Amino acid sequence: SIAQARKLVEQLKMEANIDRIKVSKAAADLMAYCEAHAKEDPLLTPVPASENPFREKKFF
Amino acid sequence: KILLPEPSIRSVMQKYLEDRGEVTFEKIFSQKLGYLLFRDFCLKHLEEAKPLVEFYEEIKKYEKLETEEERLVCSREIFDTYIMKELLACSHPFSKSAIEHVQGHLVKKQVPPDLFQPYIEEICQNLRGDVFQKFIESDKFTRFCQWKNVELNIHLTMNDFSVHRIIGRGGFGEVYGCRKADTGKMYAMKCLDKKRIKMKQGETLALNERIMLSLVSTGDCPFIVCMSYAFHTPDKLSFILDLMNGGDLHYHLSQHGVFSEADMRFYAAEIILGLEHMHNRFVVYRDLKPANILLDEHGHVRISDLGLACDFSKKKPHASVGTHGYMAPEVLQKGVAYDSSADWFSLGCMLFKLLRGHSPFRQHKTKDKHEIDRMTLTMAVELPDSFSPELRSLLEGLLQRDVNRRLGCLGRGAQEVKESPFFRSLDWQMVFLQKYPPPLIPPRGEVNAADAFDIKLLDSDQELYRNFPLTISERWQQEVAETVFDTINAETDRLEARKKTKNKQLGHEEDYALGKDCIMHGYMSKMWQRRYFYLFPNRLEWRGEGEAPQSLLTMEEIQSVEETQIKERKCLLLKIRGGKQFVLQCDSDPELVQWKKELRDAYREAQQLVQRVPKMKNKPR
Amino acid sequence: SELDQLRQEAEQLKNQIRDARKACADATLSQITNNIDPVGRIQMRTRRTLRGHLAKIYAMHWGTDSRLLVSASQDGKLIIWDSYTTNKVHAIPLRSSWVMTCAYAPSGNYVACGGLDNICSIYNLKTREGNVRVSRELAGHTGYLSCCRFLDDNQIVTSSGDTTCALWDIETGQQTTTFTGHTGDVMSLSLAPDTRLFVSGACDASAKLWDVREGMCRQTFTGHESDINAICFFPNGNAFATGSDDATCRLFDLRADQELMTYSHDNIICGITSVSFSKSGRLLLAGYDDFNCNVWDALKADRAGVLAGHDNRVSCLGVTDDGMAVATGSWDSFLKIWN
Ligand SMILES: O=C(NCc1ccn[nH]1)c1cc([C@@H]2CCNC[C@H]2COc2ccc3c(c2)OCO3)ccc1F
Ligand SMILES: *N[C@@H](CS)C(=O)OC
Ligand SMILES: [Mg+2]
């Protein structure tokens, strides 16, 4: 397995050379996505019962 | 009456049999019912197979043909049809050596019974394999299983028979004539009393009889009282033997008086072939005397009561055992071994008694047994002048005091007796076929025909008799074949085609086991509610009739599968995870065996398998 | 000792990566989101129960219509339900009892499933003939199938206990691309929205990000203490969730290339069997071996609610594309649909 631990290294090189970003921004982008679309999320912003298959919608 | 199972029993029996390697061609072809359903398949459902079975059947008939002239004619009829026609049709799948064996033998007008034997082997060759496999794929192997299930679940009682008038009475028991209800086959039922056996200390006698019977009751021997079944009741041992309602030669020697040379010769031959049968299978009869030879309706004879006989393949016996007038010198010598020679001196003694009305060493009605024993050893009996010189060389040969000089001892056995000048008129083939006319035909419905000159029991006693019940396969399969087999196969056929037209009309056609990974499926009952079961690698589903299964158990949740007893019957006992219990009852002894097997194989298998799967095993809680 | 200098270059390179990330670690999501209002009390209720399977359910999957779902059980069967009525669309008895996973094609046209049979079997639900038939079997893997997902009607990614994933071509029946990398059984995979990328969790306690086309492991995320059983992309495609035997879920960011958050609680001791986001990404639903599903505030790590419905293990779950409902599937043999 001398052939094999050399393949692990050439892999780790790939994992290291990447453009990273600050956690601060990452989090900022997630949080901003969540608020962007929170009105389109029925689990947070309920819809009317008549438009909900699982409450009161009659026609399909 | 015999009711067969349903074609769904295949799934269980095929597995039962495969475990024992009885789903091969040799094991099925060589059974009577196996042969018959196989024959049927090759004759009616597979165009390549019919001329091979047809030919087979034709040779088998040729083998039975009595006269040399019949053979010459039949052999050329077999040649020109199954060799020459097949060959001109470019349709003869058989070797050169096979062809040239028969053609060689025919052109020289040699037509022995065995002539066709290379073709028996090469027919078998072409039947086993592709043909056999399609036969397993067919309804007929389905039907074989339906039949072979009924066989492996035989349990007899008195109520399976219909007992008629007595036909014998000895020291330990008494024989009756009966009918087996389901086939309507006539038999004799021996009924030995347990209470008497214990009282006279003949557990060794009763026991030895059954082991001995079993060792002789295959092959179809006309001249011994062979056994089809043995069984127990609360206080009786019952053998089911060949019916013989014509009394015994000791009773008939009383009525008729002595016989002639011609008349004793008849009884001689039929007895000699009886002895020959047991000596091929390494059994010495020993207790050969006229009281032990029996008669059918027609006046043909059989050898009876094998208690005092014993096996000699393993260890040649040395005791003096048997009746005193007719034992051999080496039998009476203590510490001296003996083989089949005991009987040929006995024969000689019995044969004299038929002619002269006493044992040849019992001189003057003398009960002094140790005078009959010293005349046997010192005296070479003098033979009256009346006796023919052909009769003398026989009786002298048979009553040589040395084993090294006696007839049938010099190495060729019965064949040395058959070759005596006394029997020079006889065709032994025709003796075997029972063709010679018997002397005494018994009077119709005679009273006292085959009679003799004559505390409790614990569990500890009946532990002797718990490996008593037996059923000889060859014999049961014969009985069936010659009575009900045909009409039941036709009854069961109409019955399974009416349920087809019914289950098609009601919708339920598609079978739930197919295209899946079902291990085994069949009927069982659970507490009793009867359902149909399907056993998969990871669960046991079940259904009622006319639905799909809506219920199951998993192989995970089964903890052990044990065998318990409920209401005088044997059952399976599944302990389930979380202490709950499942009980299954089965329709037959083979089904019970195989379910128990296949459930245990399955749950051990599954649990092992699941353990190695993170997404399926149990984890800590 | 070429094996010693490569076993020392590994431990060294590993630390280079630790450093590049600890330098991006300037704030915490918890800090960044400390200000936004909490989500509330989520009291979803059972709106449908789905009776049918005869034993444990192991897996399920919503169709893109947010209405039909496919479910895979120990009873050796796939059921395809119409959530709106509880009607069965199809019951599909299988060739193998040992099934573990199932998947519904985006189109509507096929479903897939697999197990200890070691083969992803494609089924066609609209044959010319109008019957549900196996239209393909995808043999290749040398271990059990634990999850699969379609890209389209001709392509499917699988993950096996042979420690590998693979993109197939359903016509050719062969592996277009093999994804070797994991050191232990691969339990779950999730596709990015654009389907040019996907992530996988494994019993080696790591998740991996792969490229569909170029076929290599781009990034590797550690931190879990124990087998990762499920994994799930966050809707924008930039982050993913995981669920482990260690009794935690975790959120991982792709560009920051490290763990942003941990969802857990000292009351919670059982392991996670499945994860799923609500539509906006704000809620993170998680299925557990204590017979509950927990709703987490993805941003704030608060536990917003509990779906408490089944009498055995919640084994699987999922939110509908239109966001309207969530389904759970348990070892109690029932699915339930909630909101
Ligand atoms: O007690 C008898 N025999 C001794 C013994 C003990 C254990 N095994 N054998 C016995 C003997 C006879 C008679 C006694 C006179 N010699 C013939 C013999 C056998 O009788 C028959 C009579 C009819 C038969 C049959 C045998 O087999 C088929 O049909 C009848 C019933 C018996 F129980
Ligand atoms: N309900 C109909 C349209 S009115 C349908 O197509 O399904 C949502
Ligand atoms: Mg002796």
Side-chain angles (χ1 to χ4, degrees):
Chain A
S1 59
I2 306 160
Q4 198 204 321
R6 197 173 48 77
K7 191 184 166 189
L8 166 63
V9 166
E10 280 296 357
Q11 164 61 25
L12 283 163
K13 288 179 159 179
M14 286 286 288
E15 276 177 46
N17 284 269
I18 53 152
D19 280 318
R20 302 184 165 74
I21 78 165
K22 299 222 216 309
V23 172
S24 63
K25 177 164 165 186
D29 296 343
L30 293 176
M31 187 190 57
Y33 186 90
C34 288
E35 291 197 313
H37 297 292
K39 281 165 211 188
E40 298 165 5
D41 180 325
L43 294 160
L44 296 170
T45 325
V47 299
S50 60
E51 296 168 18
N52 189 339
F54 307 94
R55 302 280 184 98
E56 284 186 355
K57 185 149 158 68
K58 251 162 162 171
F59 291 154
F60 299 93
Chain B
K1 186 197 152 176
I2 281 162
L3 178 57
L4 298 181
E6 278 171 41
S8 44
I9 202 144
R10 179 170 178 165
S11 187
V12 183
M13 290 309 302
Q14 185 157 4
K15 288 263 197 189
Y16 187 80
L17 302 173
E18 257 148 55
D19 288 355
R20 297 156 168 79
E22 331 222 289
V23 198
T24 71
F25 175 82
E26 183 256 310
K27 306 276 277 155
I28 294 185
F29 192 82
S30 81
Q31 284 181 2
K32 201 68 203 281
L33 306 181
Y35 179 69
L36 286 161
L37 294 149
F38 182 87
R39 169 190 168 288
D40 225 67
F41 170 79
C42 300
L43 292 169
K44 301 187 185 199
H45 302 265
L46 187 49
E47 292 143 37
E48 51 166 302
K50 71 184 156 161
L52 303 163
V53 167
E54 284 171 23
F55 191 177
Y56 185 77
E57 299 221 299
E58 208 77 276
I59 298 157
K60 283 289 144 189
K61 280 176 202 156
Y62 172 91
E63 289 173 1
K64 308 161 201 299
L65 276 174
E66 294 159 15
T67 81
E68 201 204 342
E69 189 59 43
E70 279 170 290
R71 267 128 52 197
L72 291 149
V73 179
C74 180
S75 59
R76 197 191 268 111
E77 223 158 60
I78 290 165
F79 190 107
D80 291 338
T81 293
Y82 297 111
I83 297 175
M84 196 62 165
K85 173 211 81 200
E86 284 199 45
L87 273 154
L88 271 152
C90 312
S91 200
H92 191 53
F94 290 98
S95 65
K96 173 191 292 171
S97 45
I99 287 169
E100 296 178 354
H101 184 268
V102 178
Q103 171 171 35
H105 276 83
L106 280 204
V107 161
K108 293 181 164 202
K109 294 167 158 220
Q110 296 167 359
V111 284
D114 71 323
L115 167 62
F116 284 99
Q117 185 51 236
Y119 279 98
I120 287 291
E121 285 143 7
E122 295 185 22
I123 280 161
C124 287
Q125 181 60 16
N126 300 32
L127 287 169
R128 176 180 37 190
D130 189 47
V131 167
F132 182 65
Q133 292 288 305
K134 285 175 190 161
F135 166 69
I136 301 291
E137 282 171 339
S138 82
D139 304 42
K140 305 321 199 140
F141 180 71
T142 310
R143 187 59 56 74
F144 176 74
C145 294
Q146 304 181 244
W147 278 107
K148 201 85 204 294
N149 182 247
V150 177
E151 170 173 7
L152 285 155
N153 180 245
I154 279 159
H155 303 268
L156 294 175
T157 45
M158 297 315 189
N159 261 341
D160 302 284
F161 299 104
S162 137
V163 69
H164 309 321
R165 67 179 179 77
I166 298 157
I167 58 171
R169 270 164 298 197
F172 293 76
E174 48 276 308
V175 185
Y176 300 81
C178 55
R179 203 189 299 278
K180 195 173 142 53
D182 56 49
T183 40
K185 167 133 221 192
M186 285 287 232
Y187 282 116
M189 178 183 313
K190 193 159 172 169
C191 279
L192 291 170
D193 179 29
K194 293 182 187 177
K195 310 198 167 187
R196 282 178 195 157
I197 283 169
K198 197 179 171 187
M199 197 164 283
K200 281 193 188 157
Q201 304 189 55
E203 287 92 349
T204 325
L205 282 61
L207 284 161
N208 201 256
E209 194 176 24
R210 198 189 59 71
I211 306 143
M212 296 287 95
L213 279 182
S214 181
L215 294 177
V216 302
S217 322
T218 43
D220 220 37
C221 177
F223 317 117
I224 306 166
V225 184
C226 292
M227 175 205 56
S228 287
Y229 315 83
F231 76 85
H232 95 288
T233 79
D235 64 331
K236 288 283 184 293
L237 303 176
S238 315
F239 306 108
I240 297 310
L241 313 183
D242 281 318
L243 181 55
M244 298 296 278
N245 57 1
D248 70 71
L249 279 192
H250 166 279
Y251 165 76
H252 290 319
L253 198 64
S254 107
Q255 306 304 109
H256 180 275
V258 295
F259 291 84
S260 41
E261 279 191 56
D263 288 327
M264 89 79 152
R265 173 147 53 219
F266 175 77
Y267 297 128
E270 299 208 334
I271 280 144
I272 289 147
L273 289 193
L275 298 177
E276 193 196 34
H277 189 256
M278 294 190 200
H279 298 182
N280 289 347
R281 296 145 131 93
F282 313 96
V283 173
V284 265
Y285 186 60
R286 312 199 284 190
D287 197 33
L288 190 63
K289 44 169 183 194
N292 276 314
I293 305 297
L294 262 67
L295 283 82
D296 62 340
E297 284 182 340
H298 291 14
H300 288 275
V301 295
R302 300 187 123 116
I303 304 179
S304 186
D305 288 13
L306 296 63
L308 277 63
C310 88
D311 190 338
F312 77 93
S313 61
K314 59 196 81 185
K315 66 190 78 171
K316 297 194 167 183
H318 72 278
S320 336
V321 181
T323 317
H324 268 278
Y326 332 83
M327 280 180 280
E330 76 283 4
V331 175
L332 300 175
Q333 289 163 349
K334 296 167 187 177
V336 181
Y338 55 72
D339 66 18
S340 66
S341 72
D343 293 329
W344 299 127
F345 200 96
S346 294
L347 181 60
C349 292
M350 190 197 81
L351 287 196
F352 187 96
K353 169 88 165 191
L354 300 191
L355 288 174
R356 295 279 281 120
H358 56 99
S359 316
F361 304 109
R362 179 162 154 282
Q363 283 183 348
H364 291 300
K365 278 223 156 190
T366 195
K367 294 181 180 164
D368 187 353
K369 65 181 73 212
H370 319 113
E371 187 89 80
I372 305 167
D373 298 332
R374 81 155 269 277
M375 297 291 183
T376 296
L377 299 164
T378 55
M379 136 185 175
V381 58
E382 38 172 299
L383 313 179
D385 291 328
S386 61
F387 281 23
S388 99
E390 293 203 315
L391 171 61
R392 287 163 63 192
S393 87
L394 179 70
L395 277 160
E396 280 174 12
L398 288 171
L399 300 169
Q400 293 267 340
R401 283 141 42 185
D402 298 29
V403 174
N404 325 300
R405 303 194 175 174
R406 198 180 308 163
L407 226 66
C409 310
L410 313 183
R412 308 215 313 290
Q415 192 58 44
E416 285 160 26
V417 174
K418 298 187 206 197
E419 278 184 11
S420 188
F422 187 77
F423 297 110
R424 188 175 133 187
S425 38
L426 295 186
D427 180 9
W428 292 92
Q429 185 61 15
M430 300 293 223
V431 177
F432 182 91
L433 296 166
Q434 310 184 298
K435 294 276 210 157
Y436 288 115
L440 166 45
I441 298 181
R444 211 216 164 198
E446 73 181 28
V447 300
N448 295 110
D451 298 17
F453 222 79
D454 296 42
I455 311 173
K456 296 180 182 176
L457 62 103
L458 278 182
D459 270 46
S460 87
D461 297 289
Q462 298 196 311
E463 196 70 76
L464 287 150
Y465 307 125
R466 76 140 205 177
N467 293 349
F468 201 92
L470 190 62
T471 292
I472 304 267
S473 189
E474 205 205 317
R475 285 216 181 263
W476 183 86
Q477 280 198 19
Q478 189 45 233
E479 170 186 308
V480 172
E482 73 199 0
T483 61
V484 295
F485 190 77
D486 283 36
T487 55
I488 278 172
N489 277 328
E491 277 156 25
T492 292
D493 273 17
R494 292 185 269 99
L495 182 45
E496 293 174 3
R498 276 203 278 100
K499 294 176 194 166
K500 168 152 176 168
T501 306
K502 176 148 194 179
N503 304 326
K504 189 173 175 184
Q505 193 168 339
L506 304 174
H508 182 68
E509 200 168 24
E510 62 283 10
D511 187 43
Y512 187 82
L514 300 165
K516 279 179 205 174
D517 63 345
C518 178
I519 287 182
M520 191 164 79
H521 58 86
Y523 285 108
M524 315 160 89
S525 302
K526 57 160 184 77
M527 170 50 188
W528 296 119
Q529 314 140 13
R530 196 146 177 289
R531 299 292 148 156
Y532 203 57
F533 285 65
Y534 305 94
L535 179 65
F536 294 88
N538 79 346
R539 65 198 193 283
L540 180 54
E541 287 178 16
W542 63 82
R543 63 174 173 76
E545 226 127 306
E547 61 183 68
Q550 326 301 4
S551 274
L552 57 85
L553 289 161
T554 61
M555 292 303 113
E556 281 153 26
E557 75 197 312
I558 285 155
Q559 281 194 336
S560 84
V561 183
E562 282 281 75
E563 188 164 301
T564 188
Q565 298 196 344
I566 301 164
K567 309 223 175 201
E568 69 155 8
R569 287 180 205 174
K570 193 199 281 166
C571 293
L572 301 191
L573 172 59
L574 321 181
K575 296 188 184 178
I576 317 287
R577 199 179 73 82
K580 293 153 211 171
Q581 295 194 338
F582 211 76
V583 298
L584 291 174
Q585 199 212 51
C586 279
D587 319 75
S588 50
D589 299 46
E591 278 176 299
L592 186 132
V593 165
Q594 196 69 14
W595 275 110
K596 201 213 79 167
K597 165 155 171 291
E598 292 287 5
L599 287 166
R600 291 160 82 150
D601 286 13
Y603 92 72
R604 292 194 184 114
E605 192 87 288
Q607 286 170 4
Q608 179 157 28
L609 184 51
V610 173
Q611 201 55 27
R612 308 192 282 260
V613 194
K615 169 154 204 168
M616 297 174 181
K617 65 177 137 205
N618 309 77
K619 292 187 162 174
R621 306 188 176 173
Chain C
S1 72
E2 202 197 304
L3 194 63
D4 297 9
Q5 72 171 349
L6 294 169
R7 282 174 185 180
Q8 286 177 33
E9 200 178 8
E11 296 164 36
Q12 187 181 15
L13 268 149
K14 282 170 202 180
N15 292 347
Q16 171 172 346
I17 294 163
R18 288 165 207 185
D19 291 26
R21 298 167 164 171
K22 284 179 209 173
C24 304
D26 63 323
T28 67
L29 173 63
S30 77
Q31 284 160 8
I32 299 269
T33 68
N34 234 109
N35 214 354
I36 64 192
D37 299 340
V39 298
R41 193 186 195 174
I42 301 298
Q43 292 186 104
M44 297 184 265
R45 294 193 70 211
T46 296
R47 301 300 160 172
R48 314 267 190 283
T49 299
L50 299 189
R51 190 187 57 59
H53 288 293
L54 309 164
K56 291 175 187 182
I57 306 184
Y58 291 113
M60 60 88 63
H61 199 241
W62 283 105
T64 65
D65 58 42
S66 304
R67 181 180 178 177
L68 309 181
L69 61 149
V70 68
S71 73
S73 170
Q74 190 184 45
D75 71 358
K77 229 165 268 138
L78 287 196
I79 296 165
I80 294 171
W81 315 80
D82 173 32
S83 74
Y84 285 12
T85 52
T86 76
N87 286 338
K88 282 163 187 119
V89 175
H90 292 119
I92 297 163
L94 295 184
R95 302 171 183 190
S96 193
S97 308
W98 304 104
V99 57
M100 271 173 63
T101 167
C102 47
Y104 212 131
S107 64
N109 292 319
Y110 306 90
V111 303
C113 56
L116 314 187
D117 51 65
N118 299 9
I119 296 151
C120 178
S121 323
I122 312 307
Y123 283 78
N124 183 2
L125 306 161
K126 298 202 178 68
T127 57
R128 291 181 184 184
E129 316 303 291
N131 303 49
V132 185
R133 301 185 157 188
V134 180
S135 83
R136 184 69 83 228
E137 284 174 331
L138 304 176
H141 286 298
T142 71
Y144 58 82
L145 197 79
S146 61
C147 177
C148 53
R149 295 270 168 265
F150 288 89
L151 312 203
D152 59 38
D153 291 14
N154 202 22
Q155 290 201 290
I156 190 163
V157 188
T158 49
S159 66
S160 157
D162 73 357
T163 92
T164 69
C165 300
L167 173 68
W168 301 71
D169 184 338
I170 296 158
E171 202 68 289
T172 80
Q174 306 305 322
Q175 304 187 347
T176 295
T177 304
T178 295
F179 302 112
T180 68
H182 283 287
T183 87
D185 295 4
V186 190
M187 306 292 288
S188 174
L189 74 92
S190 166
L191 296 167
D194 64 346
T195 75
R196 299 172 179 170
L197 293 178
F198 84 91
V199 291
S200 62
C203 296
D204 63 32
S206 70
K208 286 191 183 307
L209 168 74
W210 312 84
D211 186 333
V212 168
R213 290 194 183 185
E214 289 169 307
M216 79 294 183
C217 173
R218 285 217 147 97
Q219 285 158 255
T220 303
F221 302 82
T222 64
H224 269 300
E225 295 189 37
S226 199
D227 300 1
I228 300 161
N229 300 336
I231 198 172
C232 174
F233 255 97
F234 180 101
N236 74 5
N238 296 158
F240 66 93
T242 49
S244 163
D245 256 348
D246 65 26
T248 85
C249 304
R250 298 193 195 210
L251 178 69
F252 290 105
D253 191 284
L254 290 193
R255 286 170 302 157
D257 189 61
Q258 56 176 285
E259 182 185 332
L260 302 188
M261 190 125 258
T262 287
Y263 314 81
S264 96
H265 194 32
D266 316 62
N267 283 27
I268 295 170
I269 51 157
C270 57
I272 289 71
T273 72
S274 48
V275 289
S276 179
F277 283 104
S278 61
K279 187 159 177 65
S280 68
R282 180 56 183 283
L283 300 178
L284 173 62
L285 293 91
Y288 295 72
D289 175 58
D290 67 6
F291 326 159
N292 293 306
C293 149
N294 281 285
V295 179
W296 298 98
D297 196 318
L299 295 183
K300 301 186 79 77
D302 297 336
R303 175 169 80 146
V306 180
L307 326 185
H310 301 286
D311 325 61
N312 213 250
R313 177 178 305 187
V314 175
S315 81
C316 51
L317 57 72
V319 164
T320 60
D321 277 358
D322 67 0
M324 288 265 166
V326 50
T328 49
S330 152
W331 279 15
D332 76 339
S333 89
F334 301 83
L335 287 142
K336 277 154 181 227
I337 307 301
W338 320 65
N339 59 38

